[PDB]
Amino acid sequence: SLMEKLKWKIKCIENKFLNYRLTTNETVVAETEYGKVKGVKRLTVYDDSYYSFEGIPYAQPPVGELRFKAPQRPTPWDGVRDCCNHKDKSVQVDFITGKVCGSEDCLYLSVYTNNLNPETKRPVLVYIHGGDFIIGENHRDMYGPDYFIKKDVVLINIQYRLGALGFLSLNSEDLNVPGNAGLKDQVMALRWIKNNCANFGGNPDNITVFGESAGAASTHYMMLTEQTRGLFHRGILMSGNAICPWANTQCQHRAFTLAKLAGYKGEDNDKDVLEFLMKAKPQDLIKLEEKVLTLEERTNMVVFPFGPTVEPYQTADCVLPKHPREMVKTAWGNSIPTMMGNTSYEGLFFTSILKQMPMLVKELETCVNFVPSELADAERTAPETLEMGAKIKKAHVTGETPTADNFMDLCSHIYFWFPMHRLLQLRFYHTSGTPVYLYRFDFDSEDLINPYRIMRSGRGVKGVGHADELTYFFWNQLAKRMPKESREYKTIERMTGIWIQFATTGNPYSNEIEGMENVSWDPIKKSDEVYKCLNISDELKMIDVPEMDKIKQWESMFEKHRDLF
């Protein structure tokens, strides 16, 4: 919307000057294994303060011959690297302006803490942003640490390569482009964190990794791969995981298609395709990415052309040697305390998509296109497939004619709740009682917002959509100071409080969090037929997951195919 584009522009300039007024003249030097870094003390609008180090490199800039390759360790320096300002984001299409932005020089992390020499070593919370593996950043205009730093933790926000630059994959072993470069970036950042967090007051024996959407799938991948075994101690999966249908794809044949879109005149062989892509301008590749999926792939409901993939051959840095469902069978992260959850109306994310293409509601007539692909026949015309679709339809079509709200409710389940259920049940076979706790974010406000609302044209619309909880974890350029007594302020304290408590102890309950005093929050047991979750609304209450009945209806599709569940 052009009206929202100007509004967003205005906010960007106002934010810039606010950030000047929040900068103090106090700078500080910290040590890293690669050299000294200079950070700056900043204020928040609530007059808390924190030390800010941005643009700490954890890898060599992945440029030139290092494009498409696994990250390499950075070059050390003498003297003091200035970390008082942010670096670029990974090359991507800006979600508001629609133009390509960012830089290939993006392999940085940011470290924040209210005290660089604390009296006790602190829980380290590491945030991995979402954005479908194609957008996102660690810039504070979206991921401000201002709320977490009220408490005595170290917060670290990482970047990683996005799009084709992070996720190209080629079958030819001689080329050393097996895939998952962006996940390998995450691995190298977590190793940096283990090796350096003590220099900022952090406890290397108490690291928690958390992320939302693609960042939740990323956190899960970091809990599955052998590359990170033992590197961290708690994980939080917010609205996603690595067995979600949207979280991985086999993209080895798509480099050729991208090259052709970018002007390549050669034959489909990996060596010639790579040499062309190595010479292309990065903006050209990222701009064309939205055209890469073929008619057949769109027909088969492939979501994104480049993303996490099962790597076709083994390398020293290999992150995903098998499908994530197989990786769960041997995963080190099954044995660390885990928290998982979703919002109360995830599918609201599709509001503007449905406004643009209202005919999508016709997919609810039979629902065959929502049947898990491992159960469906190829043509989606088999009677068994239609019956499976009928079970989906019964779960979500509540009136005589299917509605957009029915569609959006279905979306919550296909993309979030059902993969969460499948993961929980699979994981019980491959863990020794390590607890998993469930939350449900159910707090609705429009007095404090984040840019995901603009994306879904969700102004004036009620409901707790995908990513609406991030408003209560991170300051952003649309945020404003809330009164201490306000429901929004209380939700900030509760959300950050629960995450810090879980990061500290592996148990998200604490009687020091307002409204939690009377909460008995047990972890999920294999014997549970109905999941219990902490529902976060204006109150904190343990409830039967309201989505359970629909979850069970989706599971019923596997009654005669239990080996695939």
JSON list of N, CA and C in Angstrom, two decimals, residues 46 443 445 447-448 472 480-494 514 538:
[
{"chain": "A", "resi": 46, "resn": "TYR", "atom": "N", "xyz": [12.37, 3.31, 28.22]},
{"chain": "A", "resi": 46, "resn": "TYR", "atom": "CA", "xyz": [12.03, 3.12, 29.63]},
{"chain": "A", "resi": 46, "resn": "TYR", "atom": "C", "xyz": [13.18, 3.49, 30.55]},
{"chain": "A", "resi": 443, "resn": "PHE", "atom": "N", "xyz": [-2.67, -13.22, 23.41]},
{"chain": "A", "resi": 443, "resn": "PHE", "atom": "CA", "xyz": [-2.84, -11.84, 23.84]},
{"chain": "A", "resi": 443, "resn": "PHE", "atom": "C", "xyz": [-2.97, -10.94, 22.62]},
{"chain": "A", "resi": 445, "resn": "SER", "atom": "N", "xyz": [-3.63, -7.23, 21.03]},
{"chain": "A", "resi": 445, "resn": "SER", "atom": "CA", "xyz": [-3.66, -5.78, 21.19]},
{"chain": "A", "resi": 445, "resn": "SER", "atom": "C", "xyz": [-3.26, -5.14, 19.87]},
{"chain": "A", "resi": 447, "resn": "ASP", "atom": "N", "xyz": [-2.53, -1.68, 20.36]},
{"chain": "A", "resi": 447, "resn": "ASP", "atom": "CA", "xyz": [-1.86, -0.49, 20.89]},
{"chain": "A", "resi": 447, "resn": "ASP", "atom": "C", "xyz": [-0.35, -0.59, 20.77]},
{"chain": "A", "resi": 448, "resn": "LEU", "atom": "N", "xyz": [0.18, -1.79, 20.59]},
{"chain": "A", "resi": 448, "resn": "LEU", "atom": "CA", "xyz": [1.59, -2.02, 20.36]},
{"chain": "A", "resi": 448, "resn": "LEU", "atom": "C", "xyz": [1.66, -3.06, 19.25]},
{"chain": "A", "resi": 472, "resn": "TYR", "atom": "N", "xyz": [6.20, -8.45, 21.86]},
{"chain": "A", "resi": 472, "resn": "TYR", "atom": "CA", "xyz": [6.35, -8.50, 23.31]},
{"chain": "A", "resi": 472, "resn": "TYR", "atom": "C", "xyz": [7.71, -9.02, 23.73]},
{"chain": "A", "resi": 480, "resn": "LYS", "atom": "N", "xyz": [6.12, 1.93, 20.98]},
{"chain": "A", "resi": 480, "resn": "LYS", "atom": "CA", "xyz": [6.12, 3.13, 21.79]},
{"chain": "A", "resi": 480, "resn": "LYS", "atom": "C", "xyz": [6.15, 2.73, 23.26]},
{"chain": "A", "resi": 481, "resn": "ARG", "atom": "N", "xyz": [6.52, 3.68, 24.10]},
{"chain": "A", "resi": 481, "resn": "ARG", "atom": "CA", "xyz": [6.51, 3.46, 25.54]},
{"chain": "A", "resi": 481, "resn": "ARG", "atom": "C", "xyz": [5.06, 3.24, 25.99]},
{"chain": "A", "resi": 482, "resn": "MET", "atom": "N", "xyz": [4.83, 2.15, 26.71]},
{"chain": "A", "resi": 482, "resn": "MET", "atom": "CA", "xyz": [3.58, 1.77, 27.38]},
{"chain": "A", "resi": 482, "resn": "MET", "atom": "C", "xyz": [3.61, 2.01, 28.89]},
{"chain": "A", "resi": 483, "resn": "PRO", "atom": "N", "xyz": [2.47, 2.40, 29.45]},
{"chain": "A", "resi": 483, "resn": "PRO", "atom": "CA", "xyz": [2.39, 2.59, 30.90]},
{"chain": "A", "resi": 483, "resn": "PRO", "atom": "C", "xyz": [2.65, 1.28, 31.64]},
{"chain": "A", "resi": 484, "resn": "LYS", "atom": "N", "xyz": [3.27, 1.39, 32.82]},
{"chain": "A", "resi": 484, "resn": "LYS", "atom": "CA", "xyz": [3.59, 0.21, 33.62]},
{"chain": "A", "resi": 484, "resn": "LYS", "atom": "C", "xyz": [2.37, -0.65, 33.90]},
{"chain": "A", "resi": 485, "resn": "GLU", "atom": "N", "xyz": [1.20, -0.03, 34.06]},
{"chain": "A", "resi": 485, "resn": "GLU", "atom": "CA", "xyz": [-0.01, -0.74, 34.43]},
{"chain": "A", "resi": 485, "resn": "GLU", "atom": "C", "xyz": [-0.72, -1.34, 33.22]},
{"chain": "A", "resi": 486, "resn": "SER", "atom": "N", "xyz": [-0.27, -1.02, 32.01]},
{"chain": "A", "resi": 486, "resn": "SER", "atom": "CA", "xyz": [-0.99, -1.42, 30.81]},
{"chain": "A", "resi": 486, "resn": "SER", "atom": "C", "xyz": [-0.85, -2.92, 30.55]},
{"chain": "A", "resi": 487, "resn": "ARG", "atom": "N", "xyz": [-1.90, -3.48, 29.94]},
{"chain": "A", "resi": 487, "resn": "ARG", "atom": "CA", "xyz": [-1.87, -4.90, 29.59]},
{"chain": "A", "resi": 487, "resn": "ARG", "atom": "C", "xyz": [-0.69, -5.24, 28.69]},
{"chain": "A", "resi": 488, "resn": "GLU", "atom": "N", "xyz": [-0.29, -4.31, 27.81]},
{"chain": "A", "resi": 488, "resn": "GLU", "atom": "CA", "xyz": [0.84, -4.57, 26.92]},
{"chain": "A", "resi": 488, "resn": "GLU", "atom": "C", "xyz": [2.15, -4.65, 27.69]},
{"chain": "A", "resi": 489, "resn": "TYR", "atom": "N", "xyz": [2.36, -3.71, 28.61]},
{"chain": "A", "resi": 489, "resn": "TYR", "atom": "CA", "xyz": [3.60, -3.71, 29.38]},
{"chain": "A", "resi": 489, "resn": "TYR", "atom": "C", "xyz": [3.70, -5.00, 30.19]},
{"chain": "A", "resi": 490, "resn": "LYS", "atom": "N", "xyz": [2.59, -5.38, 30.81]},
{"chain": "A", "resi": 490, "resn": "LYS", "atom": "CA", "xyz": [2.57, -6.61, 31.60]},
{"chain": "A", "resi": 490, "resn": "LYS", "atom": "C", "xyz": [2.92, -7.84, 30.71]},
{"chain": "A", "resi": 491, "resn": "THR", "atom": "N", "xyz": [2.44, -7.84, 29.47]},
{"chain": "A", "resi": 491, "resn": "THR", "atom": "CA", "xyz": [2.72, -8.93, 28.57]},
{"chain": "A", "resi": 491, "resn": "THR", "atom": "C", "xyz": [4.21, -8.96, 28.18]},
{"chain": "A", "resi": 492, "resn": "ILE", "atom": "N", "xyz": [4.83, -7.80, 28.01]},
{"chain": "A", "resi": 492, "resn": "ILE", "atom": "CA", "xyz": [6.28, -7.77, 27.79]},
{"chain": "A", "resi": 492, "resn": "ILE", "atom": "C", "xyz": [7.00, -8.44, 28.95]},
{"chain": "A", "resi": 493, "resn": "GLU", "atom": "N", "xyz": [6.68, -8.04, 30.19]},
{"chain": "A", "resi": 493, "resn": "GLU", "atom": "CA", "xyz": [7.34, -8.59, 31.37]},
{"chain": "A", "resi": 493, "resn": "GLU", "atom": "C", "xyz": [7.12, -10.10, 31.46]},
{"chain": "A", "resi": 494, "resn": "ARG", "atom": "N", "xyz": [5.90, -10.54, 31.17]},
{"chain": "A", "resi": 494, "resn": "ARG", "atom": "CA", "xyz": [5.59, -11.96, 31.28]},
{"chain": "A", "resi": 494, "resn": "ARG", "atom": "C", "xyz": [6.30, -12.78, 30.21]},
{"chain": "A", "resi": 514, "resn": "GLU", "atom": "N", "xyz": [4.39, -12.06, 37.37]},
{"chain": "A", "resi": 514, "resn": "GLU", "atom": "CA", "xyz": [3.06, -11.64, 37.81]},
{"chain": "A", "resi": 514, "resn": "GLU", "atom": "C", "xyz": [1.97, -12.45, 37.11]},
{"chain": "A", "resi": 538, "resn": "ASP", "atom": "N", "xyz": [-4.68, -11.93, 28.73]},
{"chain": "A", "resi": 538, "resn": "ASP", "atom": "CA", "xyz": [-4.53, -10.96, 29.81]},
{"chain": "A", "resi": 538, "resn": "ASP", "atom": "C", "xyz": [-4.17, -11.66, 31.12]}
]
